[PDB]
C-alpha cells in the first residue's frame, strides 16, 4: 500500500492543482498496491477558501490509480477553481490482500457520516475486533470490514471525551496509538483542525518532505515529550511552506529532496505551518528522478532489465579494484575479522530473494568453506529453526521492509547471532536492525518483478565471498578468475540483451501453452527456479522449475511431446550430468529449448531452437542465464496481453502478513 | 534387469517342474520393468538325465514372461517328463542398455552356436569396446549388439587357453571379472561343468536362496583366496546330498521357497561344484541369514493393483514400522539399530540428512520435529544437488542417508562422500543387505515390507515414523521434553486406527478425482508441517497421474506464485489445526480474494473451514508433527483415482531410464 499528502500552507492552489498532486504521488506509489485507491480533501464551493475546511470530500474508486484519476475528474459538483491559500489533502492507494477492492474498503476511512476526523493507514490492527466490539457499544456504527475504520472511530471517541476545549490534535492521536496493536503507518485529517496534519508510524515507514524558497529554522527537529519557535520546523521570515507526507520516498523526490525520516512512536504534526515532533534529523536524498522514470522504455520492467549492464556496474561502483585484484565492501570493515571467526552462514529472505541465496550458496561453500543455509523467511519462522551466537545470519531484501524477513531478523538477533543486511533501501528497517549491511545500489526498482535487484543481489554476494577469502594463497587464482568474470560481466550483458529478438520469436511458439518446465542443475538451480517464478508472476502460465537430477525420480513422467520444457546447459563441471538430463527428455519424445554456450556446438548442433549465451566464469553464469528467462517472460506476458508491470493478485513488498 | 536360476542336486524334477519354477521366478522380477526375456536349460530327451548336460538349449523372445511361457510349452521336440536328478536353469528378465529388444539381443547370452558356455547378467560393461576387438581379434563372432556378449565370448577364450585341463570354473570366471569393467551381477552355466553354477556380483544385487531336508554344514560360509575346498570349508546337506539352490538379483523370487539366503558382496566368486557352495575372492565369511518376508507381502491378493494394495495396507506397515521399538505400556523408545551409536549421535553439533525424490520428502517432513527434539540444526539435503556443491562435511556431523530400495545412485554417492569427511553417517532402508544399509555406521529398517509398485507410498510413512521414533529417542533424557515425548507417543498409538479413518473416505476422494478428471493442472497449498505433503502429494500426482501438480509454500503466494489463482486455476489447500493454523487461514482468504475455489483438506472438528468451503477432506486430528502423515493420503488415493478414470495403469513404469545405446 502507498501513503500520500499534499499540504500547501500559504502557498496559493486552486482545487485541480491540488488533486493533481496528490494523484500523481498516487501514481509513484501505484506499484505498492493497485487494487483501489482514494483521495481526501475540503469540500464545499465558496470563494473564500476559509468558509470550506469544514466540509471533507472523498472520492474512492476500485481499480488502479487511473480509475480514481477519471472518477475525480468529470465530477458535476465540485468546482475545480477554487483557490486555497491553506489545504491539506490526503490520498492512498491500497493492496486489497483480503475482501472486495471496494470503495467502502478504500482509504481514507471515516469516522462519522459527515467526515468529522479521516485516516489512510499501511499495515494491521491486531486487535481491531476489541476495538470495533468497544466502539460499536459507545454508539459508533461501522461500514466496511477494514481494519482502519477502528482508527477513525476512536480518534473520534478520543475527542468526544476530550477534559479540555483545545486538546491539541497530537494528544488525540496519542491517545489513539496507546489503544492500537501491530503495525501502522498514518496520516491524520479533521475540520476541527483546518489544515493541520499528523503522521505517526509504528512498524512501517513514514516520512515527511519539505519544500519552501525560505530558509528554513532547523536542520535537527528535536523530539518532545508530555511547541515553540526554537523547537519546530519552519520558514524563517515567511509562511510560505509545503509538506509531504508519504511511506516512500520515490513520491516526494519529484518536489524536494529534504524529508525526515520518522522513527516508532513519533508523532510528527503540522501546526500553523510548522512541524514539530512529539513522542529527529533532516536528510538530502541522493536519489535522482531520473531513477523512478521509465525513459525511452515502455515499461520500468523492460528498462531494469535493459539497465542491469549498468546497475551491475552500480553495484561494484568503489567496492571492485581491477588493477591490483582487491574488494572493499565498505559496509562490512568494522565486522568483517569476527564474520570469519564465526562457524556457520545462514540466508534468509523470500522469493527471488532467496533464488539469490540459492544462486550464491555454492561459491559462498567454496571461497569461505563454511556450512551455508539458505531458507524461506515463511518457513525459518514456522519452524523456530535454532540458531547460535557463532552464526552469520544473512538478510536479502530489496526493500528491507519484506515483513518475514524482517521477523526473521529478529528471531535472530534474540538468539545473539551476528547479523548481516543485503539491501537496496537505505532508510529501511532491515538496515537499520541489523549490525551491518551492503547496500546493493541497484537504483529504486519499480517493476513489481524483481529484475535487477536479483542480479546485484547476485554480485553483492559474491563480493563478499571474495573478501572472506582474500588471505588464502591456494584460492588467489580462483579470485582473480572471478574478478576478471566481473570486469567483462557487463559487457556480456549487453551481449545477452542484444539477442532480445531471437527470444520474442520464441516467446511466439509458447504463449498460448498452458504449462512450461524450467530445468536445470547446480548454478543454474536457482536459474530454473527464478525463471519459473517470474513466468509464473507475469505471465500467468503455469511454469515450474524442477532440479535436472531430480528428473529420474518422478518429475520426467510429465514430460511428452506436448509438454514445453527450458534447458539450461552451461560449461560448467555439471555438463555430462545435464547431457544426460537433455537425453532423457528427448527419450520421452520432449522438444526443448535449451540454453546454453555460444560455442557449445555439441548442443547447438542436435537442438532446433537454442539461446547461445557467451561465457563467463561458472559461479557468475547464473547471472547471464537467467536474463533470457527475465526477456523471455517479458516477451509472454506482451503476447498474452497482460501488463508486465502490474500483475495481477499482488504488488510489490510483502511488508505485511 | 532380474536374475533367477534353479539348481536341484540330488531333488528329482521334470524338465516340466523345471521351467515352471524358472517361469515363476522371472513373474517375482517382472515389478521392476522389462522388454525381453529368456531361459537356459539342458536339452536333449534322453531318459537318462546324465547324457543331457552336454547339451543346452536356450529360449529367449522380445515381450512378456506369459509369451515366454507360450514358446516353452510349444517347442515339438522338448519332451518335458525327463527326470533330471541333477540340473540348472537360468532365467533372466532384460531392460535393454545396449541393442534393441531382440531374440539375439535377449539374455542368456552364449560363447558359440553350441552354446557352451552361457550367461545372465544385469547392469553394463563399460569397456565392452575394447573386450569385442580384442575377442574378435582372436577369431571370436559376435551375433548380438549386447555387451553382456563380451561376458560369454569372454569365459570362454579363457577356457580355450587354460593351462591345466582341470581348471575350475572359478577359475575362468575369476578371470573373466577381472578384465571386465562396470556393473554387474553374473550368472554362468556351461556344457564343461555340468550341474555347476557360478555366480559373481560388483555393484548390483545377488543372492543364494538354499533349501534342504537335511542339515546344513554351516551358517557362515568361509572365504577363499587365491585355503583348500573342503567339508569345512562350503555349505552342504551334511549326511545326504540333496538340496536346492535358488541364484536370484532380488530375494522376492526366493522366498516362496526358502528364507535362508546368502547376499554376495562385490567381486565374490561362488560356486556350486557336486552340490556343495563355496565362495572365492579375488576370518571372513558370509552369513546363511533368515529373512523376514513372505510371498504374500509381494501380491496383489483382494486388491486390482500392487498400489492400492500399498495405500490402503498403510495401517498395517505403520504397525510394523515401530514393533519392537514403541513399547506402547511403559511409553519408551528404542531402535535397536543404534544402541551402539546413540550416545555418540547425541554428542555430534549437526544432522544432515540426504536422499532423493520422496525420500528426500520424508525428510522435509520430519525437519521440525528434529529440530525440536534434538534441538541440533537439521539440514535437508536433495543428493545430486549436494553432490554438485561439494557441500562442506565435518567429523562431528550426523548424516543420515533415506533410501527405500538402499541403491540410488547419488545417494549412495553422497553417503561415501560424507563417510571419506569422517561424518557419522546413518542409513534409514527398507532393504536387507543394500549398499546403503550396508555402507552407513549403522542404521535402521523401516519394516514396511517390499515395495512392489511403482510409486513410494508406504516407504514415506514409514520413513516419516522412524525419523520420529528417532527423534523420541534423542531427547529421552529431558524432563522438560517428557509431556511432549508422551503426547507424541499416544499419537502413534492411534495412528494406525487414524489411518484406516482417512482411508474410510475413499469414496470422497473419488468424487474430487471425478472433479479434476480433466484439469491440466493443480495447485497444492501448505506450509509448516505440511509443506511436504505439498510436495509429495504434487510428485505422487506427476509421476502417477501425468498432470502438472505442484506444491507450493503457501507463505510465498504473495511473492509472485499467486498470480496463478483465478476461476479456472483448481487449487488444494491444507489447513490442520496446528500453530500456523491462522497462517493457513489468512492464505486461504487471499486465494478466495482473487475468485480462487480450493478444495481444502482440514480437520475433521474444524466447523468455520467446511462451512465456509464447498469441497472438504476431513481428516481425524492427530498430534501436529504426525498429521502430515493423515494429510498426504488423500492424495496418494487421488493420484490413484485419477490415473484409474483416464484409463492408465498405475502398475506400469513409465519414464523408466532414457534411450538404448546402438552404437
Ligand atoms: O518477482 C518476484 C519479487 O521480486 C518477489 O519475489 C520479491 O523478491 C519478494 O517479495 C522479496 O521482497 P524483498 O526483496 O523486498 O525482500
Ligand atoms: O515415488 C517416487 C520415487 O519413490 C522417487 O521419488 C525416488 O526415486 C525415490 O523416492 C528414491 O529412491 P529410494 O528411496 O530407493 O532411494
Ligand atoms: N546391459 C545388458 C543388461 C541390461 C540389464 O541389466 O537388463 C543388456 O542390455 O543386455
Request: with cysteine; aromatic share 8%.
Given at each position: ?215 528554513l529554522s532547523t536542520d535537527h527537529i528535536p523530539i518532545l515529550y508530555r511547541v515553540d519557535s526554537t523547537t519546530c520546523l519552519f520558514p524563517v521570515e515567511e509562511k510560505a511552506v509545503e509538506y509531504y507526507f508519504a511511506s516512500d520516498a520515490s513520491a516526494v523526490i519529484e518536489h524536494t529532496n529534504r524529508v525526515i525520516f520518522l522513527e516508532d512512536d513519533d508523532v510528527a504534526a503540522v501546526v500553523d505551518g510548522r512541524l514539530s515532533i512529539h513522542r529527529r534529523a533532516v536528510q538530502t536524498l541522493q536519489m535522482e528522478l531520473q531513477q523512478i522514470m521509465k525513459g525511452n522504455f515502455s515499461s520500468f520492467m ?356
Amino acid at each position: 500500500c502507498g501513503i500520500f499528502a499534499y499540504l500547501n500552507y500559504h502557498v496559493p492552489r486552486t482545487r485541480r492543482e491540488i488533486l493533481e498532486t496528490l494523484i500523481k504521488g498516487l501514481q509513484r506509489l501505484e506499484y505498492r498496491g493497485y487494487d483501489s485507491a482514494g483521495v481526501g480533501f475540503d469540500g464545499g464551493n465558496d470563494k473564500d477558501w476559509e468558509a470550506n475546511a469544514c466540509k471533507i470530500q472523498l472520492i474512492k474508486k476500485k481499480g488502479k490509480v487511473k480509475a480514481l484519476d477519471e472518477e475525480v475528474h468529470k465530477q458535476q459538483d465540485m468546482d475545480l477553481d477554487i483557490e486555497f491559500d491553506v489545504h491539506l489533502g490526503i490520498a492512498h492507494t491500497r493492496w486489497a490482500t483480503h475482501g472486495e477492492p471496494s470503495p467502502v474498503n478504500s482509504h481514507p476511512q471515516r469516522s462519522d457520516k459527515n467526515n468529522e476526523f479521516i485516516v489512510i493507514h499501511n499495515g494491521i490492527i491486531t486487535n481491531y475486533k476489541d476495538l470495533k466490539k468497544f466502539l460499536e457499544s459507545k454508539g459508533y456504527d461501522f461500514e466496511s470490514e477494514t481494519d482502519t475504520e477502528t482508527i477513525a472511530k476512536l480518534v473520534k471517541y478520543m475527542y468526544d471525551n476530550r477534559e479540555s476545549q483545545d486538546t491539541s490534535f497530537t494528544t488525540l492521536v496519542e491517545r489513539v496509538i496507546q489503544q492500537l496493536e501491530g503495525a501502522f503507518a498514518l496520516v491524520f485529517k479533521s475540520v476541527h483542525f483546518p489544515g493541520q496534519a499528523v503522521g505517526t508510524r509504528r512498524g512501517s515507514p513514514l516520512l515527511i518532505g519539505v519544500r519552501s524558497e525560505h530558509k528554513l529554522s532547523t536542520d535537527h527537529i528535536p523530539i518532545l515529550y508530555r511547541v515553540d519557535s526554537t523547537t519546530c520546523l519552519f520558514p524563517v521570515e515567511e509562511k510560505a511552506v509545503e509538506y509531504y507526507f508519504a511511506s516512500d520516498a520515490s513520491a516526494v523526490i519529484e518536489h524536494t529532496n529534504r524529508v525526515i525520516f520518522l522513527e516508532d512512536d513519533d508523532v510528527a504534526a503540522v501546526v500553523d505551518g510548522r512541524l514539530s515532533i512529539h513522542r529527529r534529523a533532516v536528510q538530502t536524498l541522493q536519489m535522482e528522478l531520473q531513477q523512478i522514470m521509465k525513459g525511452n522504455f515502455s515499461s520500468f520492467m523492460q528498462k531494469e532489465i535493459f539497465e542491469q549492464p549498468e546497475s551491475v556496474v552500480n553495484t561494484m561502483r568503489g567496492r571492485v579494484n581491477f588493477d591490483d585484484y582487491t574488494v572493499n565492501l565498505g559496509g562490512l570493515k568494522d565486522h568483517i575479522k569476527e564474520i570469519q571467526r564465526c562457524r556457520r552462514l545462514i540466508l534468509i529472505a523470500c522469493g527471488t530473494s532467496y533464488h539469490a541465496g540459492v544462486a550464491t550458496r555454492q561459491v559462498l561453500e567454496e571461497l569461505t568453506e563454511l556450512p551455508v543455509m539458505v531458507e524461506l523467511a515463511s518457513d525459518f519462522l514456522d519452524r523456530n529453526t535454532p540458531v547460535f551466537r557463532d552464526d552469520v545470519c544473512f538478510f536479502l531484501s530489496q526493500s528491507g521492509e519484506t515483513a518475514d524477513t524482517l521477523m526473521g531478523l529478529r528471531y535472530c538477533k534474540e538468539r545473539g547471532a551476528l547479523t548481516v543486511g543485503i539491501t537496496n533501501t537505505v532508510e529501511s528497517s532491515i538496515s537499520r536492525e541489523t549490525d551491518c549491511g551492503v547496500h546493493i545500489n541497484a537504483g529504486p526498482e519499480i517493476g513489481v518483478a524483481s529484475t535487477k535487484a536479483y542480479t546485484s543481489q547476485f554480485v553483492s554476494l559474491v563480493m563478499f565471498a571474495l573478501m572472506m577469502c582474500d588471505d588464502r594463497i591456494s584460492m588467489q587464482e580462483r579470485r582473480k578468475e572471478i574478478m576478471l568474470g566481473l570486469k567483462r560481466l557487463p559487457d556480456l550483458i549487453k551481449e545477452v540483451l542484444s539477442m532480445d529478438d531471437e527470444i520474442q520469436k520464441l516467446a511466439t511458439e509458447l504463449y498460448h501453452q498452458k504449462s512450461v518446465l524450467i530445468m536445470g542443475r547446480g548454478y543454474h538451480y536457482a536459474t530454473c527456479l527464478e525463471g519459473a517464478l517470474k513466468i509464473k508472476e507475469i505471465t500467468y502460465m503455469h511454469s515450474e522449475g524442477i532440479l535436472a537430477g531430480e528428473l529420474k525420480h518422478g518429475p520426467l513422467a510429465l514430460v511428452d511431446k506436448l509438454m514445453p520444457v527450458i534447458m539450461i546447459i552451461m560449461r560448467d563441471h555439471t555438463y555430462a550430468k545435464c547431457q544426460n538430463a537433455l537425453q532423457q527428455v528427448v527419450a520421452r519424445q520432449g522438444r526443448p529449448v535449451v540454453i546454453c554456450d555460444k560455442e557449445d556446438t555439441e548442443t547447438i548442433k542436435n537442438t532446433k531452437r537454442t539461446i547461445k549465451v557467451p561465457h563467463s566464469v561458472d559461479c557468475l553464469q547464473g547471472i547471464l542465464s537467467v536474463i533470457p528467462l527475465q526477456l523471455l517472460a517479458f516477451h509472454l506476458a506482451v503476447l498474452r496481453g497482460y501488463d508486465v508491470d502490474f500483475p495481477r493478485n499482488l504488488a510489490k513488498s510483502v511488508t505485511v502478513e
